[PDB]
């Protein structure tokens, strides 16, 4: 089910054209709202007094059709950045005229070209149009992967084409888009319509558009190969790109005329459908979080807040996660109770943060498959979840489980535990204060007691994603620091983004913490080798944790526990994007700060350039103790 559209520059009659397009299978149509050759004068007589009508009547389509089926196109003669003043003035007025008519028709999107380097005036006029009434209409900038000048035939005898590699030169079109949207101050209504050429550029050129707000991909019919049967297809390299684009759910646009005249015109479209059907579908985890991509969420604080019912339900819908806990407990029981003592040695297990009891059941299943005896304590400070635990304990568990409605840092244990089991970790490992909780519960762990998890580590990786940068930017709230949204992390299923370097370890904690001078504050410096040109927008966060020995949990991409749904990555944004050249090193600094009340993170970028220290003194974000 690909959403596709037909791009035309010639519409003799709208009603007939739209019907032929829909019958061929398209979802929408890109067409000019004024005739592409109907050049218009706005200043000099007599041509400025040309009798109307200036274009088609809006009555030729229903409001619903204009709202959902038509994409406007800027007339190609409009050149707001021309070097001839008279042409600039006319283009400005003509651009406003056409854009305003598009808004008049309620069109869902309007197509404007980025076909040269200087589109400064073009951006101003657009920006002026955007700030003329608040509307949701989108503006698709038509920009090619490869500039036409860089793909022309080498047929000019006295002007040969370049044959040497120009790394930055081959990325020029991205610079066209970057400068244009920067001039427009990252307007959420301005997106990219990436146009694909017959010959693809280097991978680094294509990767440049990772994290950019690509809404449409334009496919000229002239890039289509012909197979044996006369049908149109694509090279294996182009198919590789199409698959990458389908992961971005872009809308595909077919431009040009039918060159495979032996076949009908829905053939080009039928091939896209063919490619869409051929791919690994939602593999559980991709079916799990298909609607959560690039959706910013506030990181849970299970300590400061009492989690809702359905929040625990999400925790429990992950069997692989708890079967890893079961294994970790299983191995630990065997190592602590030799076979000859399997009937006399009862191990004191304590679930610290039992929620609704998934770890309790995991501990019970572990003792059974290990053939050992355990005495369970289920500690949970959320009194609402304690309701679930005590109904469980009465109806099923029985006397074997003792539910303790208390904070593990204050609870006065009646005895000491052989094993403490806890699931206090967030996407950034310690961002829920698992170290502080386990530190306070440490007194009632036996001298030889084991903590599960035994250690966890947080990882960071610089990422580029103008899409996510914009979403964060759009999180301004009425009565707080206007930039506080950049000084706080977000849990998100990172999707449209580009990882600029390999994740490196950030913070690590071990339990039990035998050390006599416990200090959970941290200061870490990291240097990320970047081998591309890009724009830094933030740092992704992951974590690894050791439940026991070799049994582990991880959301780090290179060591991701296969099949585990829990925990999306965390995102640490930065106020201002930072340009990074190929070969430069990104130097970031992270602090874990704390007082008696709150814990928080502060981060800063020190290379290639210095950012401001983010979230100083937790002014914008704190984690409650």
């Amino acid at each position: 089910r690909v959403s596709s559209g037909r791009d035309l520059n010639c519409v003799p009659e709208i009603a007939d054209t739209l019907g032929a397009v829909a019958k061929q299978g398209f979802d929408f149509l890109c067409m000019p709202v004024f005739h592409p050759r109907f050049k218009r004068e706005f200043i000099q007589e007599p041509a400025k007094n040309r009798p109307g009508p200036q274009t088609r009547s809006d009555l030729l389509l229903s409001g619903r059709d204009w709202n959902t089926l038509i994409v406007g196109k800027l007339s190609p003669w409009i050149r707001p950045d021309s070097k001839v003043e008279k042409i600039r003035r006319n283009s400005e007025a003509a651009m406003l005229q056409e854009l305003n008519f598009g808004a008049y028709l309620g069109l869902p999107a309007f197509l404007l070209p980025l076909n040269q380097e200087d589109n400064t005036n073009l951006a101003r006029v657009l920006t002026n149009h955007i700030h003329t009434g608040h509307h949701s209409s989108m503006f698709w900038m038509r920009v090619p992967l490869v500039a036409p000048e860089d793909l022309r035939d080498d047929i000019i005898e006295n002007a040969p084409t370049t044959h040497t590699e120009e790394y930055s030169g081959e990325e020029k079109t991205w610079m066209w888009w970057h400068n244009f949207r920067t001039l427009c101050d990252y307007s959420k209504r301005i997106a990219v319509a990436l146009e694909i050429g017959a010959d693809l550029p280097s991978n680094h050129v294509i990767d440049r558009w990772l994290g950019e707000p690509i809404k449409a991909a334009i496919l000229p019919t002239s890039i289509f190969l012909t197979n044996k049967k006369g049908f149109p297809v694509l090279s294996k390299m182009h198919q590789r790109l199409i698959f990458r684009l389908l992961k971005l759910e872009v809308q595909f646009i077919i431009t040009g005329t039918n060159h495979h005249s032996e076949k009908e015109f829905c053939s080009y479209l039928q091939y896209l459908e063919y490619l869409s059907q051929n791919r690994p579908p939602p593999n559980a985890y991709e079916l799990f979080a298909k609607g959560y991509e690039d959706y910013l969420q506030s990181p849970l604080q299970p300590l400061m807040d009492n989690l809702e019912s359905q929040t625990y339900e999400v925790f429990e819908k992950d069997p692989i996660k708890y079967s890893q806990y079961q294994q970790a407990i299983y191995k630990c029981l065997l190592d602590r109770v030799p076979e000859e003592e399997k009937d006399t040695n009862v191990q004191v297990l304590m679930v610290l943060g039992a929620g609704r009891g998934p770890l309790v059941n995991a501990s019970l299943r572990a003792a059974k498959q290990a053939d050992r005896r355990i005495k369970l304590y289920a500690v949970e400070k959320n009194p609402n979840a304690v309701v679930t635990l005590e109904n469980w304990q009465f109806e099923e568990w029985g006397s074997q489980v003792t539910v303790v409605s208390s904070d593990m840092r204050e609870w006065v244990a009646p005895e000491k535990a052989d094993i403490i089991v806890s699931e206090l970790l967030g996407s950034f490992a310690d961002n829920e204060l698992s170290p502080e909780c386990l530190d306070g519960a440490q007194h009632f762990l036996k001298d030889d007691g084991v903590s599960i998890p035994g250690e966890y580590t947080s990882f960071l990786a610089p990422i580029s994603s103008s899409k996510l940068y914009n979403e964060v930017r759009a999180c301004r709230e009425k009565d707080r620091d206007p930039e506080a949204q950049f000084e706080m992390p977000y849990v998100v299923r990172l999707h449209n983004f580009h990882q600029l370097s390999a994740p490196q370890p950030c913070f690590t904690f071990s339990h039990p913490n035998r050390d006599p001078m416990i200090d959970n504050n941290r200061y870490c410096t990291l240097e990320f080798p970047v081998e591309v040109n890009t724009v830094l927008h933030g740092f992704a966060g992951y974590f690894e944790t050791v439940l026991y020995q070799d049994i582990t949990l991880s959301i780090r991409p290179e060591t991701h526990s296969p099949g585990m749904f829990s925990w999306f990555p965390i995102l640490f944004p930065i106020k201002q994007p930072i340009t990074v050249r190929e070969g430069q090193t990104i130097c970031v600094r992270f602090w874990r700060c704390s007082n008696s009340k709150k814990v928080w993170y502060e981060w800063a970028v020190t290379a290639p350039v210095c950012s401001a220290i983010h979230n100083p003194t937790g002014r914008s974000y704190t984690i409650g103790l």
């Binding site: 520059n9 010639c10 109907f38 041509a47 030729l60 036409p148 006295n158 040009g256």
Partner: protein
């Protein structure tokens, strides 16, 4: 044989005996189409009813040109190059072939010396050489980096032709060469016209209203807007007619000096054609639906 004809007149070309060819486009309103017309009585045009022949096209007529004495080659908005031919009676205009080879509006078309091949330019940035007899594209060239604004065939060399584009290139073509294109040394060029009596000489106008005389430089600021077309007269020492978007027509001499000026048009002036019968009469058409007959002194 249609009653009404589109408002925006785009082309007007005389043939040997003097019959006038007209190409019109509907650039506004409900239907965006085009038509072709033949006026054996030029003074009766554009009156649709007093015409010799006429026919409607599916899309607009961006440019056209005669192919012999009964052939009409059309550059369509649809991205197609069309060839129409008059019947033996010259009362019907019939489509000969309609090939969709360009991926955007076909903006310019020109017939080569032999009269058997033509060259077309389009906004798809392509230039194509056509075999009119076989109805196929012989060669497709992507030499420019922007819209192809104009292509002009050499008057007597069947492999040579000019082309200009919004990439600010003026390209001299010679398909006899391995690399057929050659860049000729400002503001964007918009119109080309070979000299009829001098092989290696041509003139070109730019978007700023300047006309330039070039050899394989002399120039004058003729217009206040884009120079749309350039047509040499059939005289031994030919005059140069230049039309522009400033709604004016100018007639220049050998040194690009102005000898005549007409502002009869109220909209853009789109074409100019000299009468083969009366060499001092010059006909112009524009988007004001006017067909003006100028008597050039």
């Amino acid at each position: 044989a249609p009653a009404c004809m589109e408002r925006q007149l785009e082309a007007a070309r005389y043939r040997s005996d003097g019959a006038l060819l007209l190409g019109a486009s509907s650039l506004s309103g409900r239907c965006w189409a085009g038509s072709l017309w033949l006026f054996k009585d030029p003074c009766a045009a554009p009156n649709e009813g007093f015409c010799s022949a006429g026919v409607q096209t599916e899309a607009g007529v961006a440019d056209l040109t005669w192919v012999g004495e009964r052939g009409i080659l059309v550059a369509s908005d649809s991205g197609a190059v069309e060839l129409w031919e008059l019947d033996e009676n010259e009362t019907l205009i019939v489509s000969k072939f309609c090939k969709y080879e360009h991926d955007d509006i076909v903006s310019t078309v020109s017939v080569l010396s032999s009269g058997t091949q033509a060259v077309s330019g389009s906004k798809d940035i392509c230039i194509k050489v056509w075999d009119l007899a076989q109805q196929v594209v012989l060669s497709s060239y992507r030499a420019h980096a922007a819209q192809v604004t104009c292509v002009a065939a050499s008057p007597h060399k069947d492999s040579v032709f000019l082309s200009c584009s919004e990439d600010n290139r003026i390209l001299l073509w010679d398909t006899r060469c391995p690399k057929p294109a050659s860049q000729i040394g400002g503001y964007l060029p918009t119109s080309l016209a070979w000299h009829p009596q001098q092989s290696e000489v041509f003139v070109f106008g730019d978007e700023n209203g300047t006309v330039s005389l070039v050899d394989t430089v002399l120039s004058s600021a003729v217009h206040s807007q884009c120079v749309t077309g350039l047509v040499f007269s059939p005289h031994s020492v030919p005059f140069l007619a230049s039309l522009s978007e400033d709604c004016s027509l100018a007639v220049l001499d050998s040194s690009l000096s102005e000898l005549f000026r007409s502002q009869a048009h109220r909209d853009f002036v789109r074409d100019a054609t000299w009468s083969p019968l009366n060499h001092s009469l010059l006909t112009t058409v524009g988007w004001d639906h006017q067909v003006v007959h100028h008597v050039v002194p």
